[PDB]
Ligand binder design. Sequence first.
Ligand SMILES: O=C1c2c(O)c(=O)ccn2N([C@@H]2c3ccccc3SCc3c2ccc(F)c3F)[C@@H]2COCCN12
Ligand SMILES: [Mn+2]
Ligand SMILES: [Mn+2]
Length: 185
Amino acid sequence: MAMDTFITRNFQTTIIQKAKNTMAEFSEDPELQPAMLFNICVHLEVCYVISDMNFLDEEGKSYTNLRPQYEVIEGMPRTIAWMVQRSLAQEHGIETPKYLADLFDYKTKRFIEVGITKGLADDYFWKKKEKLGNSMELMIFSYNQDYSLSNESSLDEEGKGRVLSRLTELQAELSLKNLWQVLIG
Ligand SMILES: O=C1c2c(O)c(=O)ccn2N([C@@H]2c3ccccc3SCc3c2ccc(F)c3F)[C@@H]2COCCN12
Ligand SMILES: [Mn+2]
Ligand SMILES: [Mn+2]
């Protein structure tokens, strides 16, 4: 039971193809980098869990007529993603961040960096913060039901819970299949 089989059984094809495309863009081979493949898949999966469950009307009121609260920037070629990020910044009268974000939040008009860690969410928050400063909001999640967020009006309680349930579900299935070892190494 190898990582490639695991990925096929546990991720949607849209997620898998975007992850593999990203790896190919950076000249990395999914067959030779199975930990990396899983990590990219789960990160993109989280971006979509967040984007697929959060909506706005014209007033800007939240629901779980409607438009998505978030646009996913991750999982497209960087040539395209830079156009998207600059376009969204300029459209909303905000600075274009110098780093390529993961999401754009139409509610708050902020870019978001998503981080997944097998360590302490806090620690990873502060690493990304040291680099990104005030340029973007941060959403950091761990496998052990921890998280660290940079602002009040970002993800709600149910959204936090759904991200964390999914990560916990994936870790459980990896451990069941003796593949969690692969990520630790
Ligand atoms: O955008 C990302 C990125 C993130 O957004 C992130 O949260 C963590 C890590 N990232 N990196 C991802 C990535 C994304 C998700 C999970 C693990 C990895 S591991 C390094 C790596 C990435 C992509 C291709 C590749 F060949 C890599 F080696 C690169 C960092 O340089 C900018 C693009 N990018
Ligand atoms: Mn990214
Ligand atoms: Mn990220």
